[PDB]
Design a protein around this ligand. Structure first.
Ligand SMILES: [Ca+2]
Ligand SMILES: [Ca+2]
Ligand SMILES: [Ca+2]
Lengths: 25, 25, 25, 25
């Protein structure tokens, strides 16, 4: 299986990066 | 039995995301 | 082996940190 | 033992959060 906390970590990090890039652009 | 390291990572990432959103708003 | 999801977490985090530093400077 | 890839994830996120706060403050 996969750790649900690591998936959550990825989701949070990906969203933060995406929202920040779109904010700047 | 969750990994505290991974829990810490989620707390940091989520706090950072929330603090950044609220600052931009 | 290493968890691919933890590898993705590092890649995302360090990319975000690098892009933000570069943006600011 | 602790997973070093998870330690690094915490170090990156913590550094990034701190740098961003200090930059805003
Ligand atoms: Ca503000
Ligand atoms: Ca710039
Ligand atoms: Ca500044």
């Amino acid at each position: 299986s996969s750790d649900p906390l690591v998936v959550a970590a990825n989701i949070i990090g990906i969203l933060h990066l995406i929202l920040w890039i779109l904010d700047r652009l």
